Design a protein around this ligand. Sequence first.
Ligand SMILES: [Mn+2]
Ligand SMILES: [Mn+2]
Ligand SMILES: [Mn+2]
Ligand SMILES: [Mn+2]
Lengths: 708, 708
Amino acid sequence: KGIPKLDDANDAGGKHSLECTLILTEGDSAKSLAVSGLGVIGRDRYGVFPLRGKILNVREASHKQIMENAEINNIIKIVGLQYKKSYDDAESLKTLRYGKIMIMTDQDQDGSHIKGLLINFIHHNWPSLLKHGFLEEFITPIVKALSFYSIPEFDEWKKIKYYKGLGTSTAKEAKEYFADMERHRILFRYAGPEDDAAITLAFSKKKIDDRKEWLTNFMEDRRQRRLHGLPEQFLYKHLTYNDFINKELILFSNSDNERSIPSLVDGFKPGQRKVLFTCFKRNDKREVKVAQLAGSVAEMSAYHHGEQALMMTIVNLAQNFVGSNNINLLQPIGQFGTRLHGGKDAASPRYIFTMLSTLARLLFPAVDDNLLKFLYDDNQRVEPEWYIPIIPMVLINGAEGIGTGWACKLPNYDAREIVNNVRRMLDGLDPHPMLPNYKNFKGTIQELGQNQYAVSGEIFVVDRNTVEITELPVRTWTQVYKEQVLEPMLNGTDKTPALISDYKEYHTDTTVKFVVKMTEEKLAQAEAAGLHKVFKLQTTLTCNSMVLFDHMGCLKKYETVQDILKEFFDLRLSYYGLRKEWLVGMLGAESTKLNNQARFILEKIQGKITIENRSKKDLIQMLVQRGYESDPVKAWKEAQEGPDFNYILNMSLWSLTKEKVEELIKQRDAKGREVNDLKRKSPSDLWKEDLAAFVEELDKVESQERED
Amino acid sequence: KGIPKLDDANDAGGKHSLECTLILTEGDSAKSLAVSGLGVIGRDRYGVFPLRGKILNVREASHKQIMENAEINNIIKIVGLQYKKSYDDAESLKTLRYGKIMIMTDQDQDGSHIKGLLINFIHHNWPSLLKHGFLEEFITPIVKALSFYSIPEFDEWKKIKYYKGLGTSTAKEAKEYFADMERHRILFRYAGPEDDAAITLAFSKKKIDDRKEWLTNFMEDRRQRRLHGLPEQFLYKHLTYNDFINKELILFSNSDNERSIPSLVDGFKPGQRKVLFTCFKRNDKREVKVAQLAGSVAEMSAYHHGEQALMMTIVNLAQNFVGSNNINLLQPIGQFGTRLHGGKDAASPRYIFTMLSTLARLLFPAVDDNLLKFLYDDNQRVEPEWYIPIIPMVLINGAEGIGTGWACKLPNYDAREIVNNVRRMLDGLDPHPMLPNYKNFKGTIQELGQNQYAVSGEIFVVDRNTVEITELPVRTWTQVYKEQVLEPMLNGTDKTPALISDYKEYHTDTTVKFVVKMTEEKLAQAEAAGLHKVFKLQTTLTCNSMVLFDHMGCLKKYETVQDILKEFFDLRLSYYGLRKEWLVGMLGAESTKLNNQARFILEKIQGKITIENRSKKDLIQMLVQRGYESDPVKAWKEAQEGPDFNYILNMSLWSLTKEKVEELIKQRDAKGREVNDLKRKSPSDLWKEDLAAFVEELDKVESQERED
DNA sequence: AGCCGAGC
DNA sequence: AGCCGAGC
Ligand SMILES: [Mn+2]
Ligand SMILES: [Mn+2]
Ligand SMILES: [Mn+2]
Ligand SMILES: [Mn+2]
């Protein structure tokens, strides 16, 4: 047939074609899973063809894009479809190589999306097929204990095995699935107008605001359901297209927003935050390959997605070039990106290395980990719902992402101006308004109207024939500007003639210098109409969508950055008081420990008590009878949810020495003074300390950056 | 010109061609190193072209092989050479695009080989060029401290930086090398007949026995030089072809034998032994990717070669299929190899995993590490010169390799027969002769003549038209036998008609079953001439080259396997006595430690001495005045090349408890009995224990293998 | 029409 | 002519 990736059914194309079924699979591993599952006998009436991933959404797309899509035309050639052809009469059905399409995808949310996009593909082009049951699906187990399909179905029921993707199952597992197809085959049925309303709702861009009300109801419904304790509704026989969209594909759309939309608190996404927790737990003193780090992230943080997406998430975190990250939390050791190509020049993740920027732990203090809520995957603690930075990192690095029904876009903001605003709010003032600021950007950003800005590069007049461009607007890439601006100016086009005579390129990897030559008359005309407008050095910047998950996990739209700063400030200052309440408990339990350690050793050295020959049961009963507290640190640590004196009795015999008692009393007096000192500090004083240490290293790091 | 990998000189092909120089580089990284080193000005008269690696040796090669070699014809097209063309007259030189070839390679031994193979290439085809200085080389530093070329030159002279390959140097380092070319350019000069004698000596297969006397002199010369303390002679102006071959290329040939030829002791090569030391130090409880393990091997063991060769060395160690490893020291978790294709079906090293076979530490006991000599790379201890297995592993896994002037080939041998022979020699008997035995090989191996054997598969007569092949001779691969034997029998050839009517394939991944159909008359003729001869199921096995490095590091040829077994036995039994001498010292120092720990604690509990308030200087002076020994373990450990009582004074205060003194006296009496017990054992008794434990796990592992 | 990025 | 493997 000409498609190498396809294994065609033996009866496909013959007189039995209508009884044949084409199996569309997610990944080539599922293809091999389905091929061995059918075996010799199944190879007759069942074809199997892979899909590379998420397919084209053909409801709204350009005609050229549809005709140029390799996958869409492969499915058309395999099944024998024809565009605009309605299938009713027996004469029309004779032109079909297959009678059914059975979609086989993973049981995660991304599989349901591919399911929906294939439903969206058939519903648009041939509704004659969709009404009559042309589409089926083959479900697999997500978990076993003896088979369970959806994770809510397994939790309500409660050797256990979790199935990640279709490639996890292999060998006799595939053959067992195809032995009984009554359980694993579910047919899509067309109920009526409710179905068409659901399909178009998901996959049409006219429905965006409807999808907002769609997911807003689901989020509030589940949250209220989670409050009242009602169980999570699950699926998995016939399945209507309406029920699939509303009870299944919605789970992908919500999960898409959760991963793609950052949190207001730390300005992170679940993927990124899992990366930083891993780096935080590894605490590497030397660089590690991005590929190896990605593998370690997946093991430690329970990251269930592909390795390619995770490595680019790491690379995205490490890019320091102009227009990307005002503060890069990962060091870019090796070549991560060029301002030239806008990060697309990144070297392969195997050949580049990274590690924590020294500012990472300063922005995310270690002690604040005790105040977080760490999540769990299959009894494995992984990473918190959020970290709590000393400043609103969501504003610094310009968090952005695209979900379903919502999108988030933020520009960057200067770290020092934010720290100053936090200091202003700590002294009781109102915060100053903030314009977007990009690190090492020599151009200008000025406010046009509400949430609209004008970003402009730099261009000068050297002489009558010459102009010099030393800057491009933020996110405008050197190479791109050369190809789509100066080269059309130099070579001219069909409609527009050549404006400029020549140009040269002086660029530095981190800088932009263009020297353009023009005629005297044409330069005068250029600066008459203005230089920035002619040479396209102004780009509008408007964010009217700022969408973040607040500290309650609820999706909220923020009209001004000052709202994000204020809401962050109340939470962060509240957690600073929690840190003082935690520290005085920890430092207090440590001081009691040093007191009881000192009291015991001072009585044994003075001869008040002799531990010699005392039995374990006798000594432990005597130690508690003499008034010694039991391990105040572990007692206070366990209280956050037989007596243990071991901390006293595991001390070295060196302790009784003259210098070991003297250094222990000094340790005892120093910790009590430490508790007294920190108890007299306000939570705002702790915040100012963290800010002062951050700016000290920020000045050191950024000055070392410029010198290099 | 049509070669994409080439950067041509601007003046190449013009009237200045004779002044141009073609730079042949080792690797594309050296290509980029040389391109940036020349810069804009150097791009005129200097071309640069990469070489993939070791090139063809054209002195003895087939005409088709020479004409089909892409690299050789690329250099010919680039330089403008013509075969058989002698270059003397000015009319002939006008046809050359370049006047010189400057070879740029790493300063390691492998670079010198590429240098020599290029010298061997020009010397053979165009001696008219070689006599007149057509060839030059560009040397780089191997180390700096301020520049040193050969490692013996740096050690005799003695921030230090070691340069591994040409890719280590970068940026201004490349430009510094090409600023001064008087130091870094050396011209090859033809002295006379000594040169031709040296070139042919290295690269001709008629000279093999001459290369043996060549390297035998060098090995004995350096060893005698190493004994008398004379310094190692080094190179690095003009260099004669004779001096290059004898004073440089010989260093590659000796290093080639050292890596490619196994040691008699552990049956390992430096590459393999570095792998096993790493796995031994990591002590992984779970599997690790072969790619990741290879990276860890390189870091820990200081492995300076490419990662691809190391991963296949790991895969070679893990293959359990028929005809490979009687005992695989690494587990083959994932798909390492098929008997079908003979290991060439191995999956990519990134997708497969391995770990230590449970028999690994049983064959290489951990305690014997204390008896080895560990080497050092730049102050980093890495791995011993050899391990010392309980049985001659060189015989079990059939060590083999190809060096320069020598080659080693050994078949496998049954582990149990070897253990029995060792047990026979331990009881004072003579060892039984041993035929090669391959694990799970159902065929027969019988002795023909001295060091010559007949390996035969299995074929039966089912009926008049049918024969059944259940086995193929060792190393004969299923797929290969199908293509080159049965298929020519079935389809016939031009000269030979079709012998067999049909065949079928019942194979199991670990087994071979062929059912062949023939005419009644043609089967009778087949078994008349014999079935094994007709169907090619007999392959001769002769090893007359068994070449191993003995425990002195000297190359020796062994005529019989019994010599290898005897020489191993004397060394291994000698080291078993060393283990007893080491154990009684360690167990003795441990018993003294438990005695002085008990004496101190028993006097403090009885009240004989009070440590309370005693100053550090006062107590330490008192402890030594009362007769307590100082850390017998660390004193005995340091003796193998202020007083420390810390082991006594770091004891927990729990020690003074009634059950902690009782368990300490029991520890004291148990260690003294342990010393008394092991002191009454003979070194042969320790060996028999290690053998008995090995066979117990070997029976368990191999039985679990068959059940799986 | 195309970028932005976490996903298949 | 080609395998075996530690190397480029
Ligand atoms: Mn999936
Ligand atoms: Mn960003
Ligand atoms: Mn090298
Ligand atoms: Mn082998």
